[PDB]
Point group: D3
Chain length 291, copies 6
Amino acid sequence: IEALPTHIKAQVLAEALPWLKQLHGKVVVVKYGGNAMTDDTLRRAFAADMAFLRNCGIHPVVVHGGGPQITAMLRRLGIEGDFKGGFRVTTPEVLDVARMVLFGQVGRELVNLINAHGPYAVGITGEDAQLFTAVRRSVTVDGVATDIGLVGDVDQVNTAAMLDLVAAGRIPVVSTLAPDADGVVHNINADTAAAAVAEALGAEKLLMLTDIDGLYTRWPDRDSLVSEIDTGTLAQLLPTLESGMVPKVEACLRAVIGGVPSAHIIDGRVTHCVLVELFTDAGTGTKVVRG
Amino acid sequence: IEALPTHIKAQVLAEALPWLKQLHGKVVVVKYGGNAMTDDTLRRAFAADMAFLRNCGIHPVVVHGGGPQITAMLRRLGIEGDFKGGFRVTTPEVLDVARMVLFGQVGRELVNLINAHGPYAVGITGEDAQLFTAVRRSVTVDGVATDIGLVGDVDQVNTAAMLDLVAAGRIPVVSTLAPDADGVVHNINADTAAAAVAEALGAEKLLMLTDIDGLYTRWPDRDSLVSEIDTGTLAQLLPTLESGMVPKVEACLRAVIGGVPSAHIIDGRVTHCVLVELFTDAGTGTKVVRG
Amino acid sequence: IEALPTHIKAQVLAEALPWLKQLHGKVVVVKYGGNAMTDDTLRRAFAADMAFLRNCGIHPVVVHGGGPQITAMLRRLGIEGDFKGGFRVTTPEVLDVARMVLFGQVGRELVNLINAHGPYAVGITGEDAQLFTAVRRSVTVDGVATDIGLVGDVDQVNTAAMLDLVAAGRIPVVSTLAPDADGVVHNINADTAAAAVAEALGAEKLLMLTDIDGLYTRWPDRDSLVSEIDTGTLAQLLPTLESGMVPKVEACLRAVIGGVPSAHIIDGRVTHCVLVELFTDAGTGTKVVRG
Amino acid sequence: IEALPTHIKAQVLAEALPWLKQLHGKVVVVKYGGNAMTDDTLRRAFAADMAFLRNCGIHPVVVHGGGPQITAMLRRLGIEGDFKGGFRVTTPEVLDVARMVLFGQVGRELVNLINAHGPYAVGITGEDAQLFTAVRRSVTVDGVATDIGLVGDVDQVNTAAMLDLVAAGRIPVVSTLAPDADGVVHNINADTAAAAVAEALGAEKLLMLTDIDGLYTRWPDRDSLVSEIDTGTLAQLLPTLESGMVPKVEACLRAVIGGVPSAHIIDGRVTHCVLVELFTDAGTGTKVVRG
Amino acid sequence: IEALPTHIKAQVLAEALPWLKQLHGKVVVVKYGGNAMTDDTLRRAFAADMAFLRNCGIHPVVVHGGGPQITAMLRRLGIEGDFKGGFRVTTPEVLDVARMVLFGQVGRELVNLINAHGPYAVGITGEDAQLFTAVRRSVTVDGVATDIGLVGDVDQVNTAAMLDLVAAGRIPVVSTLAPDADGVVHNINADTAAAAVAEALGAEKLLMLTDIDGLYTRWPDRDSLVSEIDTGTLAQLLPTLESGMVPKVEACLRAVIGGVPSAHIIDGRVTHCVLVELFTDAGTGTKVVRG
Amino acid sequence: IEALPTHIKAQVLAEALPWLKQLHGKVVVVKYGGNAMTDDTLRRAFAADMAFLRNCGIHPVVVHGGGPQITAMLRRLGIEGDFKGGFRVTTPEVLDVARMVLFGQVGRELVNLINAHGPYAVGITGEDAQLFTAVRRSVTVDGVATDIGLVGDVDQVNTAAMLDLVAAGRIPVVSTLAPDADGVVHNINADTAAAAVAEALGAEKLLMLTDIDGLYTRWPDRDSLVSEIDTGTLAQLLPTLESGMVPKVEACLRAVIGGVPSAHIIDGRVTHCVLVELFTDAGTGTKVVRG
Ligand SMILES: c1ccc(-c2ncc[nH]2)cc1
Ligand SMILES: c1ccc(-c2ncc[nH]2)cc1
Ligand SMILES: c1ccc(-c2ncc[nH]2)cc1
């Protein structure tokens, strides 16, 4: 990167200015998962980018999942799964493992990576200071809503206390578990939780890291890939798309309809994808606006 | 408790006044472990008592261990131990399990129990916001200091940030793990960590829950049990006492010599032992002062 | 109180927890008069209990009367009274004596008693910083409203400035005198003033110390004594009750209808009655709620 | 005052500017007594002048005595005096009367007069919030120090809390009584108390209202009257002067030696003497500086 | 001024009290121009009077013009004028000169004069921190609205930021130039700008220094001079008055109709006219109220 | 700049991270002059870069000169110069022109350019709020110190008030004129003033824009150009260098010896030179450190 002239280095930095002004002093919620968390180089770049935002006076909030790591831990403990549809039932035993893995392993890695740059990261669940609650959720198998145990959706969010946390200079790293109204802790889909937190905090942007170039309207036609779409056109395309793209689109719909100015599905396989998406126009990924 | 006259109920409450004045607005660090954490009734009373302190304008800070639960989890994962002396070596693999169990299971139980009374508890490690660091520690087997892996002592404590946390009304629940100066996370003895935190925060008292009536100078002579002792007399008795009483005495010595006005070894098998020790004169347990 | 087991001492303290949470950070207005102010032991217990509340982060506000002491001082000065009905006319001369006795003697005793526990008590009248005003009040003798001089009801209260005072850690001790809109100072019934202050400050509770076990619906039938009553049922019983119980009931009605969640008529002859009423279920006295 | 040209009105106001700059944001302690408090016109002008200072962003603090009113009240109550030298012994009974008269009558008049201009005045004793303490003082009769009861000198002053009070916009009106270290309330000479408060608060000026034109070095030679004197020359003149001028000079000496930049003995018989002394060069009275 | 008795000096100062209370903590906007800025003695008195207000806790805001100095500078630079009606066209070149003269010379004199009394004055334009904007304005020559270049009216005012500035103890000295919505800086009539700033800041008074005794309803009849007039009667008199009195009346109308309690046209040829108008009843000049 | 791959765009932004952390929350003083202020594209890039710093939570402070523009204005006004050595004497007349040009024209351009990005820029001189003073300075012609009029060096700086200004989000644009201790305004060399302000404010960096690639030790040998030098080696080279490079080196010496961690002489002819110098390693220009 040294054989590149200094006056092009300048222009690249200068073209970040409009996006620095747009985001200065604002909340950005970043759903972190997939490859951007398994490969060590992408991991470290992601942590650097959270430090970047913080050292620009931007307020990042990280929401993470960890489905596969839960599965691996359950197999290691020899805990036999019950499955309704393609859903593991979340017994009290499974919840304990999920919470232990998400908060006690997956979140800790990200906190330590970010904290390599300063005392920024703080790990939290809805349990801590009652920062958010859950409501138990059923799923539809074939065409019947069924109980798959202690799994929920985000209910209420302590918006004031969360924004106190970021105004102090902290980067919350959220593991998505929270008590219901009776104190019973549920596991929440990280994609959904990210949308709910962005709406509650009044985020300026929601970023969704996934392992795709962007949204394809007619996958796999290479030139069905769009770079911007309104929630109006996006919702009528939802019943079309691949199984795994559904939760990331529903999150973008709910956030942007909820008042978040834009949500973005970006390529987690790209190093520093957050920097590219936020401070560059030539980014991959697709932006969702209301319409 | 209803067949007891109301005018004796009054006197019991009135006699708490001097101790309410002594502790109002002050930090109290409470090492929580042993039976007071395995039995469900003592557990819930302990959480109620932390809520009690908080609703008196007192600032409790909870430090917890969980040695046996780590051991159980390692056996379940089939992770074979290496032992030098009677010490398990803490490999990177063992540290991950310890951190996951301490922060992701043991601490979560206490956070949820306390939070049954309000949005008070917040779970933290030295990793979070770089609140404290560790320095790797060796142990003496027979008469040689030996490496038992990623185990340490508390190094530095971010006193300002910790006191910000409690002045906001939060009750930190601390899992004793922290990075060394290179970012490598170590496991810290909870008894020692409690003493270090009490000294760094300028605590008014350190409470050490154990499964004993109190300190016996000549165990097991029943009337060698003392209720107050100076650090001068206590340190010369240290090489006498039982193996498990050593870490709780060393903590009291280091805290009280470090400027903490008094440290207390109290009976964790007694329901509401914290309330009895703090707001009553007829408590069991032994108070350590400087001398 | 030492021959009583420690585990019952614990339960008594633990059962205060719900009431500590209910009152933490809240205003409590306490009308102090009768025997709880003439006997030296009850006096000192009352002052201790105000210190108790303050060292729990509760915000007590004390309103006091002193009818008999005014009368004694007037007789000592040989000031001849004029009486309409059973009411002394409050001439400018009588007002001066009342103000001097209430603010310069009765209030000072309570300020010094409370201040034996710390720098808490501050003596105030509506005159000070214009904290509240009075409106001149007439009384009905037989069936004609008559002028009995410089006696009034509380008019407006400087709510903001009063709450500044308590948030600073002060326990106001209020002598009930205040200027009217023309600067002319009136004497206000302490029972009525206590109700008005509780409503203006948004108090969580109003406590009325009197020399009775509680409200008897059919005095003197021993088992007409109630421990809770709605303002609806209480107001229709008002024209029944004894002369001296009237002002304490009217105060409770006006406070609780005014939005104060509960008012309490409690037994001032009981040592630490405030502690018993607030932090115990087995208290005497009767609670007034809206209904 | 209307037949005087407007351009001389202007110059009088303009010449106040240097003294407005000197005093803006500063504490001024004013000892108020003598004729400036018995005549109703001088009274009301004094209260107006305290309002004046407050509406210039100056911080007045009023200290008052009331020797004669105590005497009158004692005669009315038929309380027989004991006299050592020319000093009444202050029994507990006499103290109660003094406190009641000073705080409950004399101070209230001044609070209401000042408060005619706004919510400024607040009445205080050392009893309130432990704002200052007393130490019991003996007096020398002929040549023996003798106990004249519950009379003292100011001991310690809660400087922080007093300055909080004035920064809130309040004008403290101080009645000079305060507890000793055992809680026993003493009466303090108002002249002495004024000097002690000025030194503790770091006052810019101490004003001493008396019924004299100023300090005469050789009374009654009319042209021995000085308008400025150093503490050096003033202390060697102290054993010369009239009995009643002694306490006002000792106060000025102790304040100015204590670091108060200047103390002033001014003519309380002059209407608006405070305004003339502070904002005019052609004032009567004598200024004391260190030297 | 020394041969005038001290007790009349007192009364002059005492009669300022009602006006000190009315203005304490309030904004006063002062349009400064005409003779009060060309003569050196009136200049220095005006600066002293701004210091006076500031050392009373009043918040002065100074708006200045400088028409003649612009003209002189343009002649010195040999810049030829274009005139439509009697209006110079404000080309970009003329604007640069106007801005340079107003902000770089006329304002600096006033800042340094005021600052002779302390660190009070700060020079500002609408350009600084975007404190206010302009909208380009046309003028009517004969009966056609015509473009006279870069001249405007005040558009929006950053009220919050302006009041931050004065609460910090600063006396803004405003040169009336401001950018339009496209960043193009316009020159604004100082009389009009003063009215707009007073309304935006919620000023208690607007003062307009002019070289007249006051408003004459039938100039030049000597006894058509009024000392108070309602906006109702004043607006119907506007089409009558002299050319140069028009802008000062329109400003008073717009301010007082805009909610400013009173606007005043006062005699700038009188030394300390501001002091006389604000703190005296025997001032010249005419007060405008709504009606 | 669009034909350049996105993954190199990323790396350029990512490599700014260490410098964002170094400067976040810190003061940077930027001396702005030469070509970076005459060409319109470099001008606008410089203003963008000040906005850049501000939208990263960095605190830029701009100091500007304008020697040539003063000269041009003096010629236009036909003001004849007196010259001692090669120095124009600064008569009161010349000072007025200099102040008018620097504050009323040169500074206004920069304020409006910066403010195109937001309400950031505020123009100030040492005159405003007494933010800094000057001391009159003589110069050595041949070998005699001579009076060249109202030219000075920065004397004292109101550090507290200046940092209040930047913490509010303002970017001061400083025109270097200030009063001496007698209120007489002097013109200060902008290079020297920049060094003094950086030292007084505790700046993290001083940037000196000049029209050179960097410091040549043996000009004009092309490979005598250094990119870093200690103050020790730099001071012994000072008597060697070109006339115009002297003031920029003396400033760097005085700032860096004064405790400013590094001063930089950078190429003002390079677009976005500030961005390149601060957030890139491949910048031109030379860094001065202490040694
Ligand atoms: C440091 C600072 C804040 C926190 C925290 N966690 C939840 C709420 N606050 C944890 C550590
Ligand atoms: C100490 C602190 C506050 C007060 C007070 N009294 C009325 C308002 N504020 C009096 C003493
Ligand atoms: C000192 C303090 C404040 C200012 C200022 N000017 C515009 C906004 N703030 C200028 C100097």
